[PDB]
Structure formats: structure tokens, C-alpha cells
Amino acid sequence: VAQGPNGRALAESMNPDLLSAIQQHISIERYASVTYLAMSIWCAERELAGFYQFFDGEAKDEQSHAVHFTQYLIARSQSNDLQTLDAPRQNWDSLASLMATAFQMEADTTSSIQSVYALAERNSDTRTTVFLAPLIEAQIQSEDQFAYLLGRVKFANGDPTALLVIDNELRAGQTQRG
Amino acid sequence: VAQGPNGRALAESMNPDLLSAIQQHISIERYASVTYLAMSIWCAERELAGFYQFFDGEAKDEQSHAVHFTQYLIARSQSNDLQTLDAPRQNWDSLASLMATAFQMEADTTSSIQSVYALAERNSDTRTTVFLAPLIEAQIQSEDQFAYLLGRVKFANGDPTALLVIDNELRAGQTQRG
Amino acid sequence: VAQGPNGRALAESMNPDLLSAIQQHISIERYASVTYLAMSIWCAERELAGFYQFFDGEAKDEQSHAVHFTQYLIARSQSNDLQTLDAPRQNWDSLASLMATAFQMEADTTSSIQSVYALAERNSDTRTTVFLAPLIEAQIQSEDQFAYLLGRVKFANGDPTALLVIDNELRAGQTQRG
Amino acid sequence: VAQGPNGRALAESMNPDLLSAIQQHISIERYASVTYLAMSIWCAERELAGFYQFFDGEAKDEQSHAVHFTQYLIARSQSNDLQTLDAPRQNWDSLASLMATAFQMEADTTSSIQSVYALAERNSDTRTTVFLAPLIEAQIQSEDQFAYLLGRVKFANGDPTALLVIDNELRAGQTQRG
Ligand SMILES: [Fe+3]
Ligand SMILES: [Fe+3]
Ligand SMILES: [Fe+3]
Ligand SMILES: [Fe+3]
Ligand SMILES: [Fe+3]
Ligand SMILES: [Fe+3]
Ligand SMILES: [Fe+3]
Ligand SMILES: [Fe+3]
């Protein structure tokens, strides 16, 4: 039995380019987490308590996704390499602009997973393509959810009254089309 | 065993300037109470039933704070001196202006506690600094809450529709960022 | 009513040096979080599942502490500034060496809070000294806990059998002297 | 409606090389089952009751996997061909050597599934690639589990005391990192 780079017994070697891609994706998830924390703060600063609660939860969820990927590398007997984390964006001129950044962040997270998936396919690392598939499935739902929240905020057309109504929806947990 | 100014057994003498400062602070809490009663009435007169209920409760809470301080003086064997209470402010041109006065009242209550705290520190009255600390902690949360209510009302920008929505939030007990 | 740097109504201005100190401390808590994640991974890589679970939980707790501080800045109407986060230490030659780093990390977190506390005292920012006191109290218990875990691991003197026994204690939630 | 090789109505024909690959994989699962039975016996002969119970359960699970594949061939209207089963390995010089064989057996089971998956992909048999994906996902977890058990036994470094502790973990159902 061979030992993998992290010292554990190795079921199947992993291409170093694929390993680096997964390590970079962990950074993307961690960056999404701190971005949603920054968005939660921006919303709290403007008394948008429902949006604050929503993004506070999204920050914790993205971190959980990051840890899920670190656990996969452990399972593959590959080394983890936790990287320096950039500071998030922290300033927006409107809730609509913040929600656009949030949607882009969610789409960019999927694009990063898809890039890892394509590289796994090129290397015939079927454990990795199989591992990623339900995460891509979850990303479709998150993209649908963020398109819903962004579209509903844009529908409000900057009316504070409409934004208060939506804020109360989010506080109540009404965060998707259902 | 020595007897304190209120006749009870005295654990530790208190500087008369610190005693006067605590007696004055009791008046501040009582004045905050009647101010919030006046605000409750102003809101009821304009059918803002959620704001009326909120301030009715704040009035009772501020009175409870006042009594809490009278109990501390009893515990320190110091005399209480319940003072003449000024009439509250009763007229505002808008809910936003009323909420600004409410926030200032809450901040001024903290500033009064802090002044008592500093005087206790100068006199090394550690019983008093310790007694006041959790009250200052509670004031941070109240200041956060009143900044939230004021900021949400200002966000409404005088739209009656938005103010009705916020009024219903307060009636439901949704009074903080959470 | 004045507006604070983050745009909310301002109860009491804050010295910019104290604000920077709190922002830096948020970074310390975030760095403790990612350090404990790195330690959790190191333990998982060596099948020390109880230590892995323990540090996984500590990572989430430190992040919660960081968010608690961001909420205080919001409450004080001060700006948050989420910073670039250094990569954690990731390599240790023994569990005993890892636990020494963990204890030092916990002690250094307290030292950072104490430095903020002293600066608040110099500026007479009593809201901040009061806010920090229960966090310092919690740090005493965490330091006691980490001294216990480090000391118990050192008692094992590198015996894998003893380390397996302690690992099972941690998996069971037996993480303190009690 | 056409009839498949096993006589049932045929939804989609299957390449004979892919059919043979699935039949061979059923043999791999059956061989893993009898290998884990042999390991269960080896452990029972040395009073390692927790390891005996663990491998007794793994033997039954591998057999269930084999039956799951026979059911897929039935569903595809393909013939099953239950093959002669080799005798398992039965002798090891140490628990650590047995656990190495167990890990290799688990990894080899995944490699066999991956080979079937690749052949299905080459033939565009999407029913089969989809059917196999959750089985590959389960194999990642089993490989992680067996790397954990092997690594924990190797950490014991042949100390009977440490092996008794781990044996009791397995009897209690503590068989993964968690
Ligand atoms: Fe994510
Ligand atoms: Fe996301
Ligand atoms: Fe009060
Ligand atoms: Fe008050
Ligand atoms: Fe902390
Ligand atoms: Fe800590
Ligand atoms: Fe199997
Ligand atoms: Fe298996």
C-alpha cells in the first residue's frame, strides 16, 4: 500500500494540477464566505435586518462548503494548503448593486467547480467528477435563489417601502421561489 | 458595626458626590420613562399602534431601571432622594424627529451612567463600578436597537406606506436587528 | 443626532486608534479560526479523529467570536474593515508541538483583547471595557482548557496508546477538567 | 418491443464487453465479501472481537453490493452469470498487514467500478454511468474509512494495549473519523 502526499494510505494518485485546482477552489469558497459576511455587515449598517440575517447564514454555509472540500482532500490522501485570503469587497451604492455582486459571486463559485470538474474529466479522476456532481446540483439551486433575490430587489426599483417588505420576507425565511 | 445614612448597617461608606450622582441618575431614568410615555401617546394619537405599544413597554422598563438603582442605594445603606420630575417633551413634527429624540434620550442615559462610573472609579468605589457594568452592557444593546428603529424610520423617508409596515413590525415584537 | 462613520446614528464617538485596534482584533479571531481549521486537518490526516472534531468546533467558535466583534462595531456606528487573512501554520512534528501552538494562539488572543481593553481604558471608552470583560472571562476558561489539553498530551510522552485514549476523550466531548 | 438477453423487454441494448465487465465486477464484490469474512475469522481467532464484528458486517455489505449489481442487470434485461469464486486470502502476520490488504481490497473495488464506468462512457451507456456514480461516491467514503482504520492501527505500532483500545472502538461502532 502506497502513502499519499498527506501521509495517509493512497487509494488512487491525483494529478498535481487537479490538486492545485481543488486547493484554489477551497479559497474561492472561503472568499465567498467572507464576501457574504461583508454583505451581511453592509445590510446591518442600513437596518436591513432580514438581508443581514440571510447573508450571515450564507457566510456560514460557504465556509461549510470549504470544509467539505478539505475533507475530500483528506479522503484522497492529498495535502491541504490553506491560502492567504483576500479582503472582500465592502462598499456598494445600493442594495441592488450588492445583490448583483452576490449573484456574480455565486455564479463564479459554480464556474470554479465546473473548471475543477472539467480537469478531473480530462484526467479520468472519476472519484472527483462524482464528488462534484451534487455540489454542482446544489449550485443550480443557489443560482436560482440568488437570481430570485436579485430580481425581486430590482423589481422594487429602489423604493424603500418595497425593500422593507422584502427585508421582512428574508427575516421570515422566505428566501426562494418555493 | 456602623450605620449608614439610611439607617442600615454600613458595609462601606460612599462619597457624598457619588451618592448625589446616583440620585441624579435615578431622576434621568425616571425622566426617560415619562419621555417614552409621552412618545407612546404621540404615536397613539396618530394611530401608530405598534410604536405606541413599543414605547409603552420602554416606559415601564425605564421605570424598572430607576427602581433597580433605588435598590442599590438601599443595599449600600445610602439614602434615596426622589426628586421633582420635569415634564417630558410632548410635541414632534414627524415620527423621524420623535425617533431622533428617543435615540438621544437613550444615549444620554448611557452618558449619565458613564459619568457615575467614572466618579466611582475616581473614588475607588468598586462595588459601584461592578454594579454599573452590566447596565452599561444593556445600554449598548438599547443604543443598537434605537439606532435600528431610527434608521429604519429614516429609510422610510416619510412614506406613510413604509411607516405602516414598520408600525406592524413593532406591534409584532420585531424591534431589533436580531 | 450625529451620524457615525458607518452611517448609523452615533451614541458616542470612538477614538480612531481604538477603532483600528478592534478591527485588528477581529483579524486575530479570524486567524485563530483558520489556524484551528489547519490543526483540525493535521489531526484528521493522522487519524486523530477526536482532536479533529475538537479543533473543527474551535474553528467555528473563533469565527463566531470574530462576528461578535463585527456586531459591536455596528452597534457603535463604527466602520468594519475586514482584512486580508494570512495563511495559517500547517505543519507540526508532533501532536504535542501542535497543542503548544494552540495554547499560544489562545493566550495571544487574550493578549490582543487585553491590549484593546487597555486602550479603551486610556480613552475612557467604558462601553468597550464593559463589552470586553465577559470575553476576557471566557478566555480564562479557554486558556485553562487548552492548558489541560496540552498538559494531558505532554503527560502521554509521545506514547501512541496514551494519545489514542486522549483522542477518544475528545471525541466523547471530554475536553476540560470539569 | 424487443426482448433482451435475459428474456425481459429491452429498453436499450448493451455492448457485450460492458456486460462482461459488469459480470466480472459482481465477482469482485463477491470476492471482497468472502475476503472480509476471512478477515473477520482471522480477527476472531486472535480475540479481536471488535475487528471481527466490523469485518463480519463489511462482508454482508459487500454481498449486498453484489446483489445490487445483479439487480441492475435484471433491470437492463441483461443476463447474469454468477461465476466461480476464488478462495480468499486467509493468513496475515499482523493486524497491520491484514488492514493493508483490506484497504487495497477496497481501493481495488473502486478501480473495478471505475473501469466499468470508463467502458460505459466509451459506449455512451448513460444509464450505466449514472447508476455507478453514487456507488463511486460511496467508495470514496469507504476508502476514507479504511485509510482511517489502517492508519490508526499503524499508529498503534504493534502495541497490544493500543490494539485493544482500537478493538473496543470498533465494537462500539466507532469506525470512522466522524
Ligand atoms: Fe459554496
Ligand atoms: Fe455560494
Ligand atoms: Fe434606563
Ligand atoms: Fe433607556
Ligand atoms: Fe476567540
Ligand atoms: Fe480562542
Ligand atoms: Fe462493494
Ligand atoms: Fe468495499
Side-chain angles (χ1 to χ4, degrees):
Chain A
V1 165
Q3 311 292 304
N6 74 3
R8 308 182 81 213
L10 178 66
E12 170 90 335
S13 63
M14 178 177 292
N15 169 250
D17 294 321
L18 179 53
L19 172 66
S20 311
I22 296 171
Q23 294 172 343
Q24 184 71 50
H25 181 70
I26 291 168
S27 290
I28 294 297
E29 302 272 2
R30 295 178 58 219
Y31 188 71
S33 177
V34 73
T35 291
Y36 295 150
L37 174 59
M39 288 170 176
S40 186
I41 292 169
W42 187 97
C43 292
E45 294 173 335
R46 288 148 185 84
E47 323 310 332
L48 297 168
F51 281 86
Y52 147 76
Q53 291 185 26
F54 173 73
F55 279 114
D56 180 83
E58 293 302 297
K60 291 172 188 165
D61 287 347
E62 292 300 335
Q63 179 70 19
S64 292
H65 302 169
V67 176
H68 184 60
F69 274 90
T70 71
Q71 286 283 297
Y72 178 63
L73 289 185
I74 290 161
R76 292 300 307 276
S77 316
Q78 298 297 314
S79 281
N80 268 283
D81 192 13
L82 296 170
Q83 295 167 351
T84 295
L85 197 65
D86 291 356
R89 178 169 178 174
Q90 294 175 280
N91 302 312
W92 293 269
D93 293 325
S94 67
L95 181 62
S97 167
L98 179 153
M99 292 305 306
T101 299
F103 180 83
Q104 197 54 246
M105 177 84 261
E106 199 65 51
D108 285 354
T109 300
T110 315
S111 178
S112 178
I113 302 177
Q114 293 182 100
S115 290
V116 181
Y117 186 102
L119 182 56
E121 271 197 315
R122 279 191 298 277
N123 288 270
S124 297
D125 178 358
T126 311
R127 285 172 186 81
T128 297
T129 64
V130 157
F131 171 82
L132 296 174
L135 309 179
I136 297 176
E137 192 174 10
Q139 281 306 108
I140 299 171
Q141 301 305 93
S142 292
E143 287 170 353
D144 193 10
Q145 172 178 40
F146 276 65
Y148 165 80
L149 297 172
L150 169 60
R152 210 165 164 88
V153 164
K154 284 164 71 62
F155 184 59
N157 195 30
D159 184 25
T161 310
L163 295 179
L164 289 164
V165 165
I166 298 167
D167 188 66
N168 286 332
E169 299 165 4
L170 270 59
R171 192 199 281 249
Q174 180 184 301
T175 64
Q176 277 172 313
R177 169 172 69 259
Chain B
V1 165
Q3 311 292 304
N6 74 3
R8 308 182 81 213
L10 178 66
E12 170 90 335
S13 63
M14 178 177 292
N15 169 250
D17 294 321
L18 179 53
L19 172 66
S20 311
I22 296 171
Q23 294 172 343
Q24 184 71 50
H25 181 70
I26 291 168
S27 290
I28 294 297
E29 302 272 2
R30 295 178 58 219
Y31 188 71
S33 177
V34 73
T35 291
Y36 295 150
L37 174 59
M39 288 170 176
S40 186
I41 292 169
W42 187 97
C43 292
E45 294 173 335
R46 288 148 185 84
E47 323 310 332
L48 297 168
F51 281 86
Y52 147 76
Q53 291 185 26
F54 173 73
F55 279 114
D56 180 83
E58 293 302 297
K60 291 172 188 165
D61 287 347
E62 292 300 335
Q63 179 70 19
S64 292
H65 302 169
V67 176
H68 184 60
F69 274 90
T70 71
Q71 286 283 297
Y72 178 63
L73 289 185
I74 290 161
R76 292 300 307 276
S77 316
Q78 298 297 314
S79 281
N80 268 283
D81 192 13
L82 296 170
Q83 295 167 351
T84 295
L85 197 65
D86 291 356
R89 178 169 178 174
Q90 294 175 280
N91 302 312
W92 293 269
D93 293 325
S94 67
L95 181 62
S97 167
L98 179 153
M99 292 305 306
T101 299
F103 180 83
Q104 197 54 246
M105 177 84 261
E106 199 65 51
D108 285 354
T109 300
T110 315
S111 178
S112 178
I113 302 177
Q114 293 182 100
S115 290
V116 181
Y117 186 102
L119 182 56
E121 271 197 315
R122 279 191 298 277
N123 288 270
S124 297
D125 178 358
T126 311
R127 285 172 186 81
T128 297
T129 64
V130 157
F131 171 82
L132 296 174
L135 309 179
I136 297 176
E137 192 174 10
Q139 281 306 108
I140 299 171
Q141 301 305 93
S142 292
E143 287 170 353
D144 193 10
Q145 172 178 40
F146 276 65
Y148 165 80
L149 297 172
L150 169 60
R152 210 165 164 88
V153 164
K154 284 164 71 62
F155 184 59
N157 195 30
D159 184 25
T161 310
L163 295 179
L164 289 164
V165 165
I166 298 167
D167 188 66
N168 286 332
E169 299 165 4
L170 270 59
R171 192 199 281 249
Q174 180 184 301
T175 64
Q176 277 172 313
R177 169 172 69 259
Chain C
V1 165
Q3 311 292 304
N6 74 3
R8 308 182 81 213
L10 178 66
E12 170 90 335
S13 63
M14 178 177 292
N15 169 250
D17 294 321
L18 179 53
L19 172 66
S20 311
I22 296 171
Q23 294 172 343
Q24 184 71 50
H25 181 70
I26 291 168
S27 290
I28 294 297
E29 302 272 2
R30 295 178 58 219
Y31 188 71
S33 177
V34 73
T35 291
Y36 295 150
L37 174 59
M39 288 170 176
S40 186
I41 292 169
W42 187 97
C43 292
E45 294 173 335
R46 288 148 185 84
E47 323 310 332
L48 297 168
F51 281 86
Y52 147 76
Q53 291 185 26
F54 173 73
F55 279 114
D56 180 83
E58 293 302 297
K60 291 172 188 165
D61 287 347
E62 292 300 335
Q63 179 70 19
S64 292
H65 302 169
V67 176
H68 184 60
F69 274 90
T70 71
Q71 286 283 297
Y72 178 63
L73 289 185
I74 290 161
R76 292 300 307 276
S77 316
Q78 298 297 314
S79 281
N80 268 283
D81 192 13
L82 296 170
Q83 295 167 351
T84 295
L85 197 65
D86 291 356
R89 178 169 178 174
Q90 294 175 280
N91 302 312
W92 293 269
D93 293 325
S94 67
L95 181 62
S97 167
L98 179 153
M99 292 305 306
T101 299
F103 180 83
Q104 197 54 246
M105 177 84 261
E106 199 65 51
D108 285 354
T109 300
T110 315
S111 178
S112 178
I113 302 177
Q114 293 182 100
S115 290
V116 181
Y117 186 102
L119 182 56
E121 271 197 315
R122 279 191 298 277
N123 288 270
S124 297
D125 178 358
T126 311
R127 285 172 186 81
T128 297
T129 64
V130 157
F131 171 82
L132 296 174
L135 309 179
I136 297 176
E137 192 174 10
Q139 281 306 108
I140 299 171
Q141 301 305 93
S142 292
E143 287 170 353
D144 193 10
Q145 172 178 40
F146 276 65
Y148 165 80
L149 297 172
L150 169 60
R152 210 165 164 88
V153 164
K154 284 164 71 62
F155 184 59
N157 195 30
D159 184 25
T161 310
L163 295 179
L164 289 164
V165 165
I166 298 167
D167 188 66
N168 286 332
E169 299 165 4
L170 270 59
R171 192 199 281 249
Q174 180 184 301
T175 64
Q176 277 172 313
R177 169 172 69 259
Chain D
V1 165
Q3 311 292 304
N6 74 3
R8 308 182 81 213
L10 178 66
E12 170 90 335
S13 63
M14 178 177 292
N15 169 250
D17 294 321
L18 179 53
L19 172 66
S20 311
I22 296 171
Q23 294 172 343
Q24 184 71 50
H25 181 70
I26 291 168
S27 290
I28 294 297
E29 302 272 2
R30 295 178 58 219
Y31 188 71
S33 177
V34 73
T35 291
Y36 295 150
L37 174 59
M39 288 170 176
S40 186
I41 292 169
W42 187 97
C43 292
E45 294 173 335
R46 288 148 185 84
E47 323 310 332
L48 297 168
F51 281 86
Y52 147 76
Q53 291 185 26
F54 173 73
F55 279 114
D56 180 83
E58 293 302 297
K60 291 172 188 165
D61 287 347
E62 292 300 335
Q63 179 70 19
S64 292
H65 302 169
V67 176
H68 184 60
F69 274 90
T70 71
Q71 286 283 297
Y72 178 63
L73 289 185
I74 290 161
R76 292 300 307 276
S77 316
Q78 298 297 314
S79 281
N80 268 283
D81 192 13
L82 296 170
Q83 295 167 351
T84 295
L85 197 65
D86 291 356
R89 178 169 178 174
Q90 294 175 280
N91 302 312
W92 293 269
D93 293 325
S94 67
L95 181 62
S97 167
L98 179 153
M99 292 305 306
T101 299
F103 180 83
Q104 197 54 246
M105 177 84 261
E106 199 65 51
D108 285 354
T109 300
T110 315
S111 178
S112 178
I113 302 177
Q114 293 182 100
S115 290
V116 181
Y117 186 102
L119 182 56
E121 271 197 315
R122 279 191 298 277
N123 288 270
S124 297
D125 178 358
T126 311
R127 285 172 186 81
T128 297
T129 64
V130 157
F131 171 82
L132 296 174
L135 309 179
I136 297 176
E137 192 174 10
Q139 281 306 108
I140 299 171
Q141 301 305 93
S142 292
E143 287 170 353
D144 193 10
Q145 172 178 40
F146 276 65
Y148 165 80
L149 297 172
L150 169 60
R152 210 165 164 88
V153 164
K154 284 164 71 62
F155 184 59
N157 195 30
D159 184 25
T161 310
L163 295 179
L164 289 164
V165 165
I166 298 167
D167 188 66
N168 286 332
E169 299 165 4
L170 270 59
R171 192 199 281 249
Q174 180 184 301
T175 64
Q176 277 172 313
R177 169 172 69 259

Short mmCIF file of all heavy atoms in Angstrom, two decimals, chain D residues 135-161:
data_model
loop_
_atom_site.label_atom_id
_atom_site.label_comp_id
_atom_site.label_asym_id
_atom_site.label_seq_id
_atom_site.Cartn_x
_atom_site.Cartn_y
_atom_site.Cartn_z
N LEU D 135 -22.38 4.81 -6.41
CA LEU D 135 -21.55 3.74 -5.88
C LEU D 135 -20.09 4.17 -5.78
O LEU D 135 -19.40 3.81 -4.82
CB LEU D 135 -21.69 2.49 -6.75
CG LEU D 135 -23.15 2.08 -7.00
CD1 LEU D 135 -23.21 0.86 -7.89
CD2 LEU D 135 -23.89 1.83 -5.68
N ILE D 136 -19.61 4.94 -6.76
CA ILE D 136 -18.27 5.52 -6.63
C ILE D 136 -18.23 6.50 -5.46
O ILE D 136 -17.24 6.54 -4.71
CB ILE D 136 -17.85 6.19 -7.96
CG1 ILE D 136 -17.75 5.13 -9.05
CG2 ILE D 136 -16.52 6.94 -7.78
CD1 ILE D 136 -17.43 5.67 -10.43
N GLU D 137 -19.29 7.29 -5.28
CA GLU D 137 -19.34 8.20 -4.15
C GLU D 137 -19.23 7.44 -2.83
O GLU D 137 -18.48 7.83 -1.93
CB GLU D 137 -20.62 9.04 -4.19
CG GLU D 137 -20.60 10.21 -3.20
CD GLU D 137 -21.80 11.13 -3.32
OE1 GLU D 137 -22.77 10.79 -4.03
OE2 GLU D 137 -21.77 12.22 -2.70
N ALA D 138 -19.97 6.34 -2.71
CA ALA D 138 -19.88 5.53 -1.50
C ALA D 138 -18.48 4.94 -1.33
O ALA D 138 -18.01 4.79 -0.20
CB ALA D 138 -20.91 4.40 -1.54
N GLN D 139 -17.81 4.61 -2.44
CA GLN D 139 -16.46 4.07 -2.34
C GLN D 139 -15.47 5.08 -1.78
O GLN D 139 -14.54 4.70 -1.07
CB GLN D 139 -15.99 3.58 -3.70
CG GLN D 139 -16.55 2.22 -4.09
CD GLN D 139 -16.32 1.17 -3.04
OE1 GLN D 139 -17.24 0.74 -2.34
NE2 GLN D 139 -15.06 0.73 -2.91
N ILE D 140 -15.64 6.37 -2.10
CA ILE D 140 -14.77 7.40 -1.53
C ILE D 140 -14.85 7.36 -0.01
O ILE D 140 -13.83 7.42 0.70
CB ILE D 140 -15.15 8.79 -2.07
CG1 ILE D 140 -14.96 8.84 -3.58
CG2 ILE D 140 -14.32 9.87 -1.38
CD1 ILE D 140 -15.53 10.10 -4.22
N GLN D 141 -16.07 7.26 0.52
CA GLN D 141 -16.24 7.20 1.97
C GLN D 141 -15.65 5.92 2.54
O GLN D 141 -15.03 5.95 3.61
CB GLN D 141 -17.72 7.33 2.32
CG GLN D 141 -18.35 8.63 1.83
CD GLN D 141 -17.60 9.87 2.31
OE1 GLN D 141 -16.72 10.39 1.62
NE2 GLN D 141 -17.93 10.33 3.52
N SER D 142 -15.83 4.79 1.86
CA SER D 142 -15.24 3.54 2.35
C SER D 142 -13.72 3.60 2.32
O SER D 142 -13.06 3.12 3.25
CB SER D 142 -15.74 2.35 1.55
OG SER D 142 -17.12 2.16 1.81
N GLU D 143 -13.14 4.19 1.27
CA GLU D 143 -11.68 4.33 1.22
C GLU D 143 -11.18 5.23 2.35
O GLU D 143 -10.15 4.95 2.97
CB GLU D 143 -11.26 4.89 -0.14
CG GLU D 143 -11.38 3.87 -1.26
CD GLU D 143 -11.21 4.44 -2.66
OE1 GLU D 143 -11.11 5.67 -2.84
OE2 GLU D 143 -11.18 3.62 -3.59
N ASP D 144 -11.92 6.31 2.63
CA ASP D 144 -11.57 7.18 3.74
C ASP D 144 -11.64 6.42 5.06
O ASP D 144 -10.73 6.53 5.90
CB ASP D 144 -12.54 8.37 3.71
CG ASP D 144 -12.14 9.52 4.61
OD1 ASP D 144 -11.01 9.54 5.15
OD2 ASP D 144 -12.99 10.43 4.76
N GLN D 145 -12.67 5.59 5.23
CA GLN D 145 -12.84 4.80 6.44
C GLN D 145 -11.73 3.78 6.59
O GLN D 145 -11.17 3.60 7.68
CB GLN D 145 -14.19 4.09 6.40
CG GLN D 145 -14.37 3.10 7.52
CD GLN D 145 -15.73 2.46 7.48
OE1 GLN D 145 -16.24 2.13 6.41
NE2 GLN D 145 -16.33 2.27 8.65
N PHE D 146 -11.40 3.07 5.51
CA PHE D 146 -10.36 2.05 5.64
C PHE D 146 -8.98 2.69 5.80
O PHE D 146 -8.12 2.12 6.48
CB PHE D 146 -10.40 1.10 4.44
CG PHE D 146 -11.41 -0.03 4.58
CD1 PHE D 146 -12.77 0.23 4.64
CD2 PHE D 146 -10.99 -1.34 4.65
CE1 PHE D 146 -13.69 -0.80 4.77
CE2 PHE D 146 -11.91 -2.37 4.77
CZ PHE D 146 -13.26 -2.10 4.83
N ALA D 147 -8.75 3.87 5.21
CA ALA D 147 -7.50 4.57 5.47
C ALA D 147 -7.41 4.98 6.93
O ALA D 147 -6.33 4.96 7.53
CB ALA D 147 -7.36 5.79 4.55
N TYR D 148 -8.55 5.35 7.51
CA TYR D 148 -8.61 5.69 8.93
C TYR D 148 -8.29 4.48 9.80
O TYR D 148 -7.45 4.55 10.71
CB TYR D 148 -9.99 6.28 9.26
CG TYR D 148 -10.31 6.35 10.73
CD1 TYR D 148 -9.81 7.38 11.53
CD2 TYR D 148 -11.13 5.40 11.34
CE1 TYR D 148 -10.11 7.45 12.88
CE2 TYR D 148 -11.43 5.46 12.69
CZ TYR D 148 -10.92 6.49 13.46
OH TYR D 148 -11.20 6.56 14.79
N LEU D 149 -8.94 3.34 9.53
CA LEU D 149 -8.70 2.16 10.36
C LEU D 149 -7.27 1.66 10.19
O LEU D 149 -6.59 1.34 11.18
CB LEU D 149 -9.71 1.06 10.02
CG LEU D 149 -11.18 1.43 10.30
CD1 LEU D 149 -12.12 0.37 9.77
CD2 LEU D 149 -11.40 1.62 11.80
N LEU D 150 -6.78 1.60 8.96
CA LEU D 150 -5.40 1.19 8.73
C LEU D 150 -4.42 2.15 9.41
O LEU D 150 -3.47 1.72 10.08
CB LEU D 150 -5.13 1.11 7.23
CG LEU D 150 -3.67 0.95 6.80
CD1 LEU D 150 -3.05 -0.32 7.37
CD2 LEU D 150 -3.60 0.94 5.29
N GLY D 151 -4.63 3.46 9.25
CA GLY D 151 -3.72 4.42 9.84
C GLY D 151 -3.72 4.40 11.35
O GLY D 151 -2.67 4.58 11.98
N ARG D 152 -4.88 4.18 11.95
CA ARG D 152 -4.97 4.10 13.41
C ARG D 152 -4.27 2.85 13.93
O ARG D 152 -3.56 2.90 14.94
CB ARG D 152 -6.43 4.12 13.83
CG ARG D 152 -6.69 4.74 15.16
CD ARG D 152 -8.17 5.05 15.30
NE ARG D 152 -8.55 5.30 16.68
CZ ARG D 152 -8.50 6.49 17.26
NH1 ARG D 152 -8.07 7.55 16.58
NH2 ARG D 152 -8.88 6.62 18.53
N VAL D 153 -4.43 1.72 13.22
CA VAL D 153 -3.72 0.50 13.61
C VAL D 153 -2.21 0.67 13.44
O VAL D 153 -1.43 0.25 14.30
CB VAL D 153 -4.27 -0.69 12.81
CG1 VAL D 153 -3.33 -1.90 12.88
CG2 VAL D 153 -5.65 -1.07 13.33
N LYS D 154 -1.77 1.32 12.36
CA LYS D 154 -0.33 1.55 12.19
C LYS D 154 0.21 2.48 13.27
O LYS D 154 1.34 2.29 13.74
CB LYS D 154 -0.03 2.10 10.80
CG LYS D 154 -0.11 1.04 9.69
CD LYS D 154 -0.19 1.66 8.30
CE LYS D 154 1.11 2.31 7.88
NZ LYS D 154 2.22 1.33 7.80
N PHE D 155 -0.57 3.49 13.66
CA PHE D 155 -0.17 4.39 14.75
C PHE D 155 0.10 3.61 16.03
O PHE D 155 1.02 3.93 16.79
CB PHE D 155 -1.27 5.43 14.97
CG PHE D 155 -0.94 6.47 16.00
CD1 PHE D 155 0.17 7.29 15.86
CD2 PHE D 155 -1.77 6.66 17.10
CE1 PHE D 155 0.46 8.26 16.82
CE2 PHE D 155 -1.49 7.63 18.05
CZ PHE D 155 -0.38 8.44 17.91
N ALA D 156 -0.70 2.56 16.28
CA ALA D 156 -0.51 1.72 17.45
C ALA D 156 0.87 1.08 17.49
O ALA D 156 1.33 0.70 18.58
CB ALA D 156 -1.60 0.64 17.49
N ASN D 157 1.51 0.93 16.33
CA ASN D 157 2.88 0.42 16.22
C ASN D 157 3.04 -0.94 16.89
O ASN D 157 4.05 -1.23 17.53
CB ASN D 157 3.88 1.43 16.79
CG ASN D 157 5.31 1.13 16.39
OD1 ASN D 157 5.56 0.57 15.32
ND2 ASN D 157 6.25 1.48 17.26
N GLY D 158 2.02 -1.79 16.75
CA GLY D 158 2.09 -3.14 17.26
C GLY D 158 1.93 -3.30 18.75
O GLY D 158 2.08 -4.41 19.26
N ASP D 159 1.65 -2.22 19.47
CA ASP D 159 1.41 -2.31 20.91
C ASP D 159 0.08 -3.01 21.18
O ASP D 159 -0.96 -2.50 20.75
CB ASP D 159 1.41 -0.92 21.54
CG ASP D 159 1.26 -0.97 23.04
OD1 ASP D 159 1.63 -1.99 23.65
OD2 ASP D 159 0.78 0.03 23.62
N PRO D 160 0.07 -4.17 21.85
CA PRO D 160 -1.23 -4.83 22.12
C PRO D 160 -2.20 -3.93 22.88
O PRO D 160 -3.41 -3.98 22.63
CB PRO D 160 -0.83 -6.06 22.95
CG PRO D 160 0.59 -6.33 22.56
CD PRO D 160 1.20 -4.98 22.33
N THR D 161 -1.69 -3.10 23.79
CA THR D 161 -2.57 -2.22 24.55
C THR D 161 -3.32 -1.27 23.62
O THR D 161 -4.55 -1.13 23.72
CB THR D 161 -1.76 -1.44 25.57
OG1 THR D 161 -0.93 -2.34 26.32
CG2 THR D 161 -2.68 -0.70 26.51
#
